[PDB]
Amino acid sequence: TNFTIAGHEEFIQTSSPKVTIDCSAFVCSNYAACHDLLSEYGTFCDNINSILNEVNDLLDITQLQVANALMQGVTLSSNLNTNLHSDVDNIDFKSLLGCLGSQCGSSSRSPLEDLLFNKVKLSDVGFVEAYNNCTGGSEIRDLLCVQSFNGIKVLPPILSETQISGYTTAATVAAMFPPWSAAAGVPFPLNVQYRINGLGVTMDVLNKNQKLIANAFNKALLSIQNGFTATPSALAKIQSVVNANAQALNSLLQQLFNKFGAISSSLQEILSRLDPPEAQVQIDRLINGRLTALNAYVSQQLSDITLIKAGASRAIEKVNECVKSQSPRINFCGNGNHILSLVQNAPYGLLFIHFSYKPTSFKTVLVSPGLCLSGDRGIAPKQGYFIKQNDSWMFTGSSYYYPEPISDKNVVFMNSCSVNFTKAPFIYLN
């Protein structure tokens, strides 16, 4: 009897840090005698660099597919990228809108996305500024540049976070202004009414309750922003990606301190206490041990990069079917009753906001599955049932209690009665 609009967040990881490791500086820092034994494993070092470059190529092609879906059939007006206004039809959307065009500074992220990047220190811009402010200065004891001097460095992706934020912004504008290139060419307030009508809600109840629907989207959007102060499930998955990558880099760096049980762990003290004839055996056991750690590290990257493309493929299908268009599929975009979904940029992935139809009140009423008229006729309702009030049969919705007169639009026609069809030779139709 009484309904409202709810909200829900969803984070889908579509990216991963790009790690590049060198073969020489990791095993042999600067010792000339160390590189002599490594020359016998020249083919082994070439295979390590080929695997890492193969993983980086998969992250580059997947990032272009995300931008391709967000920039597919998008049309904007000319007098629009001049910092226009917002809040169309009393629906506040300034939190999901960044710079309207390129007439701003370096940062063009929406206010909602700012709450996500401020809680993640090792973002795309984080690794850049970290490697810059460690060559001298005041304090350079950070573990980020210690791995850089040992052969472990993280490269930035092809498209920066600023360009990705601009792509998600154009998708939102394409669904709020003409020619509405994100909703097959229908107005935004009119599109919401058709989505609710498909669930079994009458069309006339949506016109008189326009203020209740408009205030529902504003309350839902303001409620999804206040939840970022605590630790939700969306922020927990974002913080787990940066912590998982940091643990793998620190674990691989610890392999340089393992003695591998030959004479010691460091190569400088080997050449200072052992003669060349017996020093070749001690160094060979260190190279063979360290190369095993690199071989096992690149193997985990191939297995981990496969699950990234599996999750990224779901995000591509979701944008083209839940954001850029209205797919007739059920239980795919959200949970049961689904109305609309939006996409926002997130660190190492995307953020989706799903709006659903949530009833609040209920009312028990006797309904009928179907009935037939006189003369071996037959009718059946669609997206609704048949109720009998004041000794008269009328049509009602499947998601909202509203008696409607039986017409030829809300029912189907048959050629015979059924065994469980109630007889009622009182309704007349043409």
């Binding site: 904007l76 000319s78 350079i140 202004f177 020619p179 620190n250």
Partner: protein, 137 residues
Amino acid sequence: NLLYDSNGNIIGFKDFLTNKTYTILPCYSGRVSAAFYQNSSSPALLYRNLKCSYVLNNISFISQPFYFDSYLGCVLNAVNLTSYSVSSCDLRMGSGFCIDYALPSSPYRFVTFEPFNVSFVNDSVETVGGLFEIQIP
């Protein structure tokens, strides 16, 4: 007389002579990224996360006439043409940057990378009293 940390690293030292305390910091042992075209005399260098002053003084003893500091680091043997955008880049450096080669100043141009754009229309966005402008084919 020696300061250490959790992961067995030396980060401090006190002298047996006159009391002066110091610290141990690692030294630069990085690499350099070079962009080489199909046929050219010399490729374009790129020292990531390094200023042009630190490169031409400490790690490089040769004189380079062309030098340019970018967002990704000091760029050598290239020109600053970030105002121009391309969409068919073959030498990607990340962070939305590209290096293009133009046969005849260095032949390499440091430009941006915009692979996607929005199709703009000259129609208005404000209604004219209940009517909108739509480009119908």
